[PDB]
Design a protein around this ligand. Structure first.
Ligand code: UDP
Ligand code: MN
Ligand code: MN
Lengths: 248, 248
């Protein structure tokens, strides 16, 4: 008697992007939406969804995607802050960057615009690879993008809707959810990249008690599986400790 | 001017279960659907979806959920083989077991009916915890369920639609995707349980070369993060090796 739905291995999306944002400030988010539509993210190419933090912290960096993903219909799902704005590069640029990455390295799972190169040799300085306009300067670069990374800045990242990666359930807050996503991508057997897709990010990092707390939680959690590793993020290196590193 | 959708933190599902099966044989799947409807999985409570392998191996154990989950609307998503059938315990018993688990340990992320207890002390025998009717006997038990486990038998497992866990991308095939899902649940900071929900699984243990291939791949992959661990599955122990265990 039940009538089942048979599901085939086919990408039946017709929208290229689901653009999801973590929204607290209506004015910043309206700026973002206007800029995306101006730079080619029109209704036949993209839909916009917002995790609604306008009245309080209903969601945080590690939980918002689990609610957004089921509602997305696009091929690629962007998870970005409310305070990015497209300024020059647009829809065709982003498609071309993603398709180029698929060709270069089909093991990618997460892509962003700023992050730290994968497994830096030199732990005496923080490794960075990005191209962006932000509070540190307009149209600036570190390193060379595109390139493989071990962490991404949370202002803008993306994954394929049919090949997602999830954030941890045992951390909560508004720091380190970009690195956590990259690390889970490695556990799942894929990779993270910073691509070259220049946009403007207005926000400033907040090195507050939550930042210090989550830095310690990241080290306590990840040292179990990456003992001795020094994890680079745009916000600074994190010596995870553990194992033989604890001698001294 | 885009019109965004604002998303709130609420479970809007009206169906309790999305029952997803990996299907190659129509007669076995018809028998499954008949049994689920008989034992209380009516259209007001459950929908049924099939990863369609009737014509070829379009999906395999580690990929099928990524196509199924977007199509599910139920609170809990069951992933089962086509050759399980309900025979005594039904809809109300499963709901009661999941609600009890949620009360006992809110950290759970995946549940199944047969698996190996979490971190067994005694590696001289394979740890098992199950209650099932299968090729090894009708109405049989090992161990004591419900209990936390480090692996689950793939014949039937479930997760919350809104708190999923993903299988790896860098393995493919039809063995060890129950253990892989439990290990990724640990990486995500949650837990796996075998619950008491008796059903009939009529698969055979029919041996293939892919079983040994995936056993080796699982050891090569997980030894990186779990060096020295002996991972128990109802199909046998797997010494992952790695680290100090390599000393002869
Ligand atoms: O080449 C294969 C082998 C198996 N299966 C599916 O993988 C699952 C496990 O198969 P089966 O139940 O026959 O194995 P058993 O439980 O006897 O070990 C079932 O859902 C099958 O439909 C598949 O799609 N292709
Ligand atoms: Mn920001
Ligand atoms: Mn079976």
């Amino acid at each position: 008697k039940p009538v089942p739905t048979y599901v085939q291995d086919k990408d039946e999306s017709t929208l290229m992007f689901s653009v999801c944002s973590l929204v607290r400030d209506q004015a910043k988010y309206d700026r973002l939406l206007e800029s995306f539509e101006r730079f080619g993210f029109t209704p036949d190419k993209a839909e916009f969804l917002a995790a609604d933090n306008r009245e309080g912290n209903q969601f945080h960096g590690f939980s918002w995607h689990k609610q957004m993903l089921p509602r997305c219909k696009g091929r690629y799902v962007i998870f970005c802050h409310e305070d990015v704005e497209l300024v020059d590069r647009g829809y065709d640029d982003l498609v071309a960057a993603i398709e180029a990455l698929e060709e270069a390295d089909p093991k990618w799972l997460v892509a962003g615009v700023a992050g730290s190169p994968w497994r830096p040799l030199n732990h005496s300085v923080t490794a960075q690879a990005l191209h962006i306009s932000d509070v540190f300067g307009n149209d600036r670069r570190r390193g060379n993008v595109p390139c493989r990374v071990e962490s991404l800045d949370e202002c803008f990242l993306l994954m394929r809707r049919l090949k997602p990666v999830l954030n941890s359930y045992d951390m909560q807050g508004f720091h380190y959810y970009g690195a956590d996503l990259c690390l889970q991508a490695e556990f799942l057997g894929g990779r993270a990249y910073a691509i070259d897709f220049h946009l403007h990010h207005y926000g400033r990092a907040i090195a507050d008690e939550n930042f210090h707390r989550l830095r310690q939680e990241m080290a306590q959690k990840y040292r179990r599986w990456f003992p001795g590793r020094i994890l680079h993020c745009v916000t600074g290196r994190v010596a995870l400790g553990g194992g033989w590193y604890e001698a001294r």
